[PDB]
RNA sequence: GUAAGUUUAGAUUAUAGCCAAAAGAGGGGCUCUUCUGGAACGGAAAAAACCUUUAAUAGUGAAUAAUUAACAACA
């Protein structure tokens, strides 16, 4: 129990100074989650797109109106309606076509 | 550092323990850097550029031995 | 004065290769001198953009503006040459790809007033430019569904990159 | 480690839901903690433009 | 405007440092008599060098090479 | 200027220095005029220093074409396809030599603002931090407030 | 006779402006100088902003382990650790196991520091407090 | 009308710049463009690479069937690179397979075939050749050079290198120039694996290991529109690999992928391949 | 401790402050005279005049300065 911090979450931490004292030795082997502390995968019986269709169900007046459509979209993602509004041509053209990607 | 252990200098490790080597890739300079001044009647011909020199290095290898 | 719209109609393409789709016809027609305001004529041009040849003609026939009648006459002339000179098989197979109006050279006069005042009188003239593409008008845009909107937002979130870090 | 790039990005950028009990608790101290959790300041990789805020539930 | 707690402490620390300066100025190693004339010789020598440098202004010479070298501007491939 | 100018990330052409370093510059072309004051410095350079550079770097193709020319010019071509032209109009031998040395050292990579001075293909070794890190587990994996 | 090229010099820097400013030389010239002045000033402020971000991220990482930022820094200095603030952020992000090991080392030094104060100096220096 | 000729000349340059910007010219090979000497470039090309090439053999490697037809067509109004192409491609497969096997003995023979094919892909060979100016040095009847023709030359040059410099230099050349391309490439990125769970089970039975019991290590936002699921495969109640997924199936699929990398010794923290060895 | 100074000859420019803070003198807040300091890109909320600040150069370094706050009465 030499370590001053709990070792049960991330990894076992063993801090030791070399005999000469010129170096500090740290051993950090990882710790796995106990089987008994985990739940089994749900036995009762998937692409995220499928959930989106069910979440954004078309129920009233066939396809919903623009405002209600934004409201339904806003509720699902906990976002404001202002985000969903479109933007004009001037700003749309300004966007860089090919942003650089490295690695 | 390693997967399950690390070594710390106090403030540096002994030269014997660790050997690190790298290679020089390119020598270049920097893109222009504006150096305009904030003086009344600034004028359009009152500015300077820096374009400092530059160099490129690629890491090659790291060598260690059990010399604790 | 520049008359590059007509030159666009004088362009001759190279002979098409066997492995090339049949090129759709493009016709550039314009009336350079009209005693009408370009701004007023533009309203007519804006509405008719993207419509079929027959649909535009029908609307023009029941239009009250003087410019609309001129536009119909301009449209008829373009259609006639298209079949006669641009090898258009079907008269109905035409749609309004582009329609716009431009300024023309004007005339200047002094505007007298009954109270001793004077003004600058201008006789406005304008140009009208239209490009016709053989074939039916393209299908109209379909508004994005909620599913489409949500997918883009999720994709944007995934596309987010860590900023200013090793 | 060795995880696929897209899942790794998803996991790192994921948002967590937190529960708070306000019974006999000063709102000001809770608000300071709540602001940290809500704004996403509890994450070591917090960035202003990363929208890393988390859900906070107070009862 | 009430004084912040940090401000009061900072001035006190600086005051103590100045006090240390006072003590080290309280033990003059050399008395006045010893100081007199000890470095006069060095000071005189330095002044002499100063005078020589100050009075070194004069017009510059002119050389034939300058005019003759200008002809090289016409050098070209043979 | 940064908003109005392009930028890139740190990168290497094809990891040139991993196995063996290859000079990006592949061809140098020099145009001269027999009778032109502007080329006087370039005229002397060919006599003295052009040979030394060729011996030092024999992997670059050198073209010297004296011709009637208003302003001497130097063209440098790189392996990646980059081509750069520098005017030698009224420049001395020393100025020319310094420019050539810089050209040889430079690579075909574009010279613009670099967002990051570091490029690595292995950002993480111990694993990237995620929220579940440092979170204690519970027996049976019981979720909070679960009666069970 | 080259006034056009002088305009082009201003235009190339003002092409991305909005309104009549981008097309009026009288206005375009003024904006370009102001934009250049703004960029020059931002160079110094950029470095300071980056340091602030690094400090904030370290505090969040330290607070995750329950350690305050001032305590961690002081203990590392007392331990002859000379890692810079920027590198400290990198270690936490990509080496959480090492960062936790660093946290324990700093915590042990702080505990030794508290022990040293309680000891009143009679006790010898701690194993991790040896300099 | 302003007098003078310098102003008029300056405007002419201005017109040319606009024309180039508006209508960039069609690409043309450097061979057609002025100041091209095939013999001189090859000598510089070899010296730049710090490698020795037999000019006669190298020319044959660059020579392509398409180029001959164009010259023959002009003639109507010579040795191909096929022989060299086969040697380089055939030897490269052995060399590429040998390199992979030594680093990853655990990796199955099927995986090596996929990795070797990816490294010998037309795009990869084309990408290397273009950046090396090999396209300019390539002899072909069409510009840009067709990719399959370019791929033929690249292995043909390898065959010429083998004769000129022997296997030793060529082997280092492959390591320095080709093995470098595998940096930053994940195992499944270079090898396509479907149904990872089934494959993992097949390997486990081969190793006589019990099938792991899938478990839910962590769960977050299950009922939200942004759910996170961590699924860990537990063998004999011991976790072998854990993966993150948005859905339980995705997490299980990702966890299988992690195990497969561990099975074949493809851990992200594995020792990097070494280009330093001079031997 | 430090490096300028005196004389001779020629020669112009400048010749209206501002605010803070001291010492006087009239008023009895002001009105003056005399001495000292100042002109951030930091700070006092924005802040020409107060405080910390020797010039200006690139860097994804480091140590510090001033720095809006402060913790009813019995003997």
mmCIF file of C-alpha atoms in Angstrom, chain G residues 18-122:
data_model
loop_
_atom_site.group_PDB
_atom_site.id
_atom_site.type_symbol
_atom_site.label_atom_id
_atom_site.label_comp_id
_atom_site.label_asym_id
_atom_site.label_seq_id
_atom_site.Cartn_x
_atom_site.Cartn_y
_atom_site.Cartn_z
ATOM 1 C CA UNK G 18 -17.573 42.877 -47.712
ATOM 2 C CA UNK G 19 -19.516 45.785 -49.167
ATOM 3 C CA UNK G 20 -18.337 48.742 -51.193
ATOM 4 C CA UNK G 21 -15.161 48.643 -49.089
ATOM 5 C CA UNK G 22 -13.839 45.690 -51.102
ATOM 6 C CA UNK G 23 -14.316 47.606 -54.377
ATOM 7 C CA UNK G 24 -13.598 51.239 -53.391
ATOM 8 C CA UNK G 25 -9.908 52.148 -53.349
ATOM 9 C CA UNK G 26 -10.523 55.001 -50.904
ATOM 10 C CA UNK G 27 -12.074 52.532 -48.446
ATOM 11 C CA UNK G 28 -10.141 49.409 -49.463
ATOM 12 C CA UNK G 29 -6.761 50.985 -48.699
ATOM 13 C CA UNK G 30 -7.822 51.989 -45.182
ATOM 14 C CA UNK G 31 -9.145 48.524 -44.325
ATOM 15 C CA UNK G 32 -5.979 46.761 -45.499
ATOM 16 C CA UNK G 33 -3.781 48.808 -43.164
ATOM 17 C CA UNK G 34 -6.130 48.188 -40.234
ATOM 18 C CA UNK G 35 -6.238 44.462 -41.007
ATOM 19 C CA UNK G 36 -2.438 44.318 -41.143
ATOM 20 C CA UNK G 37 -2.228 46.224 -37.853
ATOM 21 C CA UNK G 38 -4.691 43.822 -36.227
ATOM 22 C CA UNK G 39 -2.687 40.777 -37.327
ATOM 23 C CA UNK G 40 0.561 42.212 -35.953
ATOM 24 C CA UNK G 41 -0.976 42.788 -32.516
ATOM 25 C CA UNK G 42 -2.617 39.350 -32.452
ATOM 26 C CA UNK G 43 0.770 37.626 -32.753
ATOM 27 C CA UNK G 44 1.736 38.515 -29.179
ATOM 28 C CA UNK G 45 -1.712 37.839 -27.712
ATOM 29 C CA UNK G 46 -1.843 34.420 -29.386
ATOM 30 C CA UNK G 47 0.946 33.040 -27.191
ATOM 31 C CA UNK G 48 -0.709 34.248 -23.982
ATOM 32 C CA UNK G 49 -4.062 32.729 -24.951
ATOM 33 C CA UNK G 50 -2.447 29.340 -25.571
ATOM 34 C CA UNK G 51 -0.894 29.353 -22.096
ATOM 35 C CA UNK G 52 -4.294 30.099 -20.556
ATOM 36 C CA UNK G 53 -5.817 27.126 -22.380
ATOM 37 C CA UNK G 54 -3.022 24.840 -21.173
ATOM 38 C CA UNK G 55 -3.480 25.919 -17.550
ATOM 39 C CA UNK G 56 -7.238 25.352 -17.692
ATOM 40 C CA UNK G 57 -6.880 21.867 -19.185
ATOM 41 C CA UNK G 58 -4.307 20.883 -16.554
ATOM 42 C CA UNK G 59 -6.650 22.030 -13.786
ATOM 43 C CA UNK G 60 -9.463 19.874 -15.173
ATOM 44 C CA UNK G 61 -7.129 16.881 -15.408
ATOM 45 C CA UNK G 62 -5.789 17.538 -11.907
ATOM 46 C CA UNK G 63 -9.296 18.058 -10.525
ATOM 47 C CA UNK G 64 -10.325 14.744 -12.091
ATOM 48 C CA UNK G 65 -7.797 13.037 -9.806
ATOM 49 C CA UNK G 66 -8.819 15.339 -6.942
ATOM 50 C CA UNK G 67 -5.636 17.448 -6.996
ATOM 51 C CA UNK G 68 -5.680 21.233 -7.220
ATOM 52 C CA UNK G 69 -3.523 22.887 -9.865
ATOM 53 C CA UNK G 70 -1.312 24.903 -7.454
ATOM 54 C CA UNK G 71 -0.540 21.838 -5.334
ATOM 55 C CA UNK G 72 0.538 19.734 -8.318
ATOM 56 C CA UNK G 73 2.883 22.387 -9.715
ATOM 57 C CA UNK G 74 4.580 23.116 -6.384
ATOM 58 C CA UNK G 75 5.184 19.440 -5.607
ATOM 59 C CA UNK G 76 6.692 18.832 -9.048
ATOM 60 C CA UNK G 77 9.084 21.756 -8.581
ATOM 61 C CA UNK G 78 10.056 20.412 -5.156
ATOM 62 C CA UNK G 79 10.725 17.069 -6.886
ATOM 63 C CA UNK G 80 13.119 18.601 -9.458
ATOM 64 C CA UNK G 81 10.585 17.991 -12.241
ATOM 65 C CA UNK G 82 11.059 20.517 -15.051
ATOM 66 C CA UNK G 83 8.304 19.595 -17.504
ATOM 67 C CA UNK G 84 6.697 22.643 -19.084
ATOM 68 C CA UNK G 85 2.983 23.382 -18.920
ATOM 69 C CA UNK G 86 2.387 22.519 -22.582
ATOM 70 C CA UNK G 87 4.014 19.097 -22.187
ATOM 71 C CA UNK G 88 1.977 18.487 -19.030
ATOM 72 C CA UNK G 89 -1.222 18.806 -21.071
ATOM 73 C CA UNK G 90 0.126 16.324 -23.622
ATOM 74 C CA UNK G 91 1.008 13.745 -20.964
ATOM 75 C CA UNK G 92 -2.500 13.793 -19.490
ATOM 76 C CA UNK G 93 -4.206 13.559 -22.883
ATOM 77 C CA UNK G 94 -2.197 10.676 -24.352
ATOM 78 C CA UNK G 95 -0.584 9.146 -21.229
ATOM 79 C CA UNK G 96 -3.327 9.057 -18.577
ATOM 80 C CA UNK G 97 -1.591 6.161 -16.825
ATOM 81 C CA UNK G 98 1.637 8.166 -16.658
ATOM 82 C CA UNK G 99 -0.320 11.245 -15.581
ATOM 83 C CA UNK G 100 -1.902 9.256 -12.753
ATOM 84 C CA UNK G 101 1.591 8.103 -11.792
ATOM 85 C CA UNK G 102 2.652 11.754 -11.807
ATOM 86 C CA UNK G 103 -0.362 12.610 -9.648
ATOM 87 C CA UNK G 104 0.649 10.022 -7.048
ATOM 88 C CA UNK G 105 4.224 11.327 -6.996
ATOM 89 C CA UNK G 106 3.025 14.894 -6.446
ATOM 90 C CA UNK G 107 0.529 13.722 -3.822
ATOM 91 C CA UNK G 108 3.260 11.807 -1.992
ATOM 92 C CA UNK G 109 5.494 14.888 -1.981
ATOM 93 C CA UNK G 110 2.619 17.003 -0.665
ATOM 94 C CA UNK G 111 1.980 14.385 2.017
ATOM 95 C CA UNK G 112 5.691 14.415 2.846
ATOM 96 C CA UNK G 113 5.582 18.210 2.898
ATOM 97 C CA UNK G 114 2.669 18.124 5.329
ATOM 98 C CA UNK G 115 4.525 15.504 7.370
ATOM 99 C CA UNK G 116 7.670 17.647 7.383
ATOM 100 C CA UNK G 117 5.741 20.635 8.738
ATOM 101 C CA UNK G 118 4.117 18.469 11.416
ATOM 102 C CA UNK G 119 7.482 16.926 12.271
ATOM 103 C CA UNK G 120 8.847 20.473 12.802
ATOM 104 C CA UNK G 121 12.121 19.490 11.100
ATOM 105 C CA UNK G 122 13.279 17.014 13.749
#
